[PDB]
Amino acid sequence: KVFGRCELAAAMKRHGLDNYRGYSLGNWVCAAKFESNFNTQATNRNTDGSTDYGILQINSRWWCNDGRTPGSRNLCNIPCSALLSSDITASVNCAKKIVSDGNGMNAWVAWRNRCKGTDVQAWIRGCRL
């Protein structure tokens, strides 16, 4: 599923990401835009053999099991394929664990490089929340 901008904002708000660990909703929408172009089916292979999955491009090196990342962890206790669903619950629940682990949203390279320090409120302008 390819989300619309306001559609995804509303789904993320319903799942409790607005101001989660101090990150306003626009941060999460911005990160999803540049990680996956709002596409739940996005996958991207990393040079170390791990793979990033879903709308927030969550990495199999630490966070999910895809059966082909030897020596990796599964800290969200899910198959990585669950992160490609049209229902974003699994991705949001896992993202809450990631952002709590100490480095905040710096865990997402695209957020650090393209959202951090910008006017992220612009990503939820016009949306009915």
Name the token pair of 60: 């199999």
Sorted by where each begins, the domain ranges of the chain are 5-124
List the resolution, Å.
1.7
Q: What is the CATH number of domain 5-124?
A: 1.10.530.10
101 appears as a binding residue in the annotation: yes
CA neighbor of 46 nearest in space, from 29, 30, 62, 24: 62
Q: What is the DSSP letter of 58?
A: E
Edge-to-edge strands of the sheet including 43-45?
A: 43-45, 51-53, 58-59
Provide the annotated active-site residues.
35, 52
Contacts 24+ apart (CB under 8 A), 37-46: 37/2, 38/2, 38/3, 38/4, 38/5, 38/8, 39/1, 39/2, 39/3, 40/1, 40/2, 40/3, 40/84, 40/85, 40/86, 40/88, 40/91, 41/1, 41/84, 43/84
- The technique by which this structure was obtained is X-ray
